């Protein structure tokens, strides 16, 4: 290849492999905050449903027909929504499993 001319010949082989490997490696997963601490960027890596639904509506600009206050009242976090809260706990446990 053209670029191979500039680099020394013995660098030429490995690079191709690195290129070939590079085309199949799955993109970088979200980084560890420990690593990010070494960079000045302020990037980083909604448990409660009322605010999650409000954010979804805001990002979609959906107009609640009755009211958003009713939406908040419709639950008040009862046992059938505690179902969802421990569903969240389980989901983040599975996340941790995939990142041990």
């Amino acid at each position: 290849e053209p670029w191979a001319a500039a680099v020394p010949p013995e660098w030429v082989p490995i690079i191709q492999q690195d290129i070939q490997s590079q085309r199949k490696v799955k993109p970088q997963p979200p980084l560890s905050d420990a690593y990010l601490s070494g960079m000045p960027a302020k990037r980083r890596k909604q448990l409660l449903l009322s605010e999650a639904v409000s954010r979804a509506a805001k990002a979609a600009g959906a107009r609640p027909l009755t009211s958003p206050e009713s939406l908040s009242r419709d639950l008040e976090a009862p046992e059938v929504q505690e179902s969802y809260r421990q569903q969240l706990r389980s989901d983040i446990q599975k996340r941790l499993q995939e990142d041990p």
């Binding site: 690195d18 997963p29 980084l31 420990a34 690593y35 070494g38 990142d99």
Partner: protein, 271 residues
């Protein structure tokens, strides 16, 4: 007679220390420091302040010891004492003795670094940076330890600390990226030899990295070739390496600007 007051003050300070009146001893330490400085006895004042700070540290008087250490730094600054390894070790010991979370350390180090060769780059002797980094690593303050190592001139201990930090905190897939980040930052600091030694040691000693310059990880091979090119100084090689490894360099976007400095620093790339 006129001088007799100072000797009596010193004796009273000794007596108060014996009695355990630590705060009064701290105040009299301040007074003695100012009296000595007024007499231009910079060395004696600094030694007295250092002894008092060590004593207050031994007895748990954290705030008093920090104040006396800051007075030591003031003595160093005002007298324009040339940086010496012994004084740097003294300051490093004082910094280690401090409470890690206390803000005084931040005030101390910033001043201490600002003292040692305060005219250029907060450098002083990178020996001081190495000592601070080692102290933090022993304290397991990995972030500040890494920062100082990057500003230091010791790569071997730096590489060992990076290995420990990655194993303890780094994810499975970030192992190569940690050393890549450290190496690129070293180059951004214009310290090529530190980058070479740290990369070599990290690759050799890290359990999850297979020995051999032909590393399986594309990023490690890219870093090795980049170091060799920087040794050569050929801009075309740097551009080729950056282009061919773009998928790996995109793993952390900031790498790119690091390269922008590297090309400017080791390959004459205009800003």
């Amino acid at each position: 007679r006129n001088r007799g007051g100072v000797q009596r003050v010193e004796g009273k300070l000794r007596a108060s220390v014996e009695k355990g009146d630590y705060y009064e001893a701290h105040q009299m330490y301040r007074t003695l420091f100012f009296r000595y400085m007024s007499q231009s006895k910079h060395t004696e004042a600094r030694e007295l302040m250092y002894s008092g700070a060590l004593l207050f540290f031994s007895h748990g008087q954290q705030n008093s010891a920090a104040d006396l250490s800051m007075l030591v730094l003031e003595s160093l600054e005002k007298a324009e004492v040339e940086v010496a390894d012994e004084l740097l070790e003294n300051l490093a010991k004082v910094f280690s003795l401090m409470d890690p979370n206390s803000p005084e350390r931040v005030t101390f180090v910033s001043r201490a670094l600002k003292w040692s060769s305060g005219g250029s780059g907060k450098l002083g002797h990178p020996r001081l940076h190495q000592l601070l980094a080692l102290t933090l690593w022993k304290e397991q303050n990995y972030c500040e330890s890494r920062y100082h190592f990057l500003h230091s001139a010791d790569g071997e201990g730096c590489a060992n600390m990076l290995v420990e930090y990655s194993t303890s905190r780094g994810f499975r897939s970030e192992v190569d990226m940690f050393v890549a980040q450290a190496v690129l930052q070293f180059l951004c600091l214009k310290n090529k030899s530190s980058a070479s030694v740290v990369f070599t040691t990290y690759t050799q000693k890290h359990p999850s990295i297979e020995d051999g310059p032909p590393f399986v990880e594309p990023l490690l091979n890219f870093i090795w070739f980049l170091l060799l090119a920087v040794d050569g100084g050929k801009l075309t090689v740097f551009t080729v390496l950056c282009e061919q490894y773009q998928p790996s360099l995109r793993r952390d976007p900031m790498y790119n600007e690091y390269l922008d400095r590297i090309g400017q620093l080791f390959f004459g790339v205009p800003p």
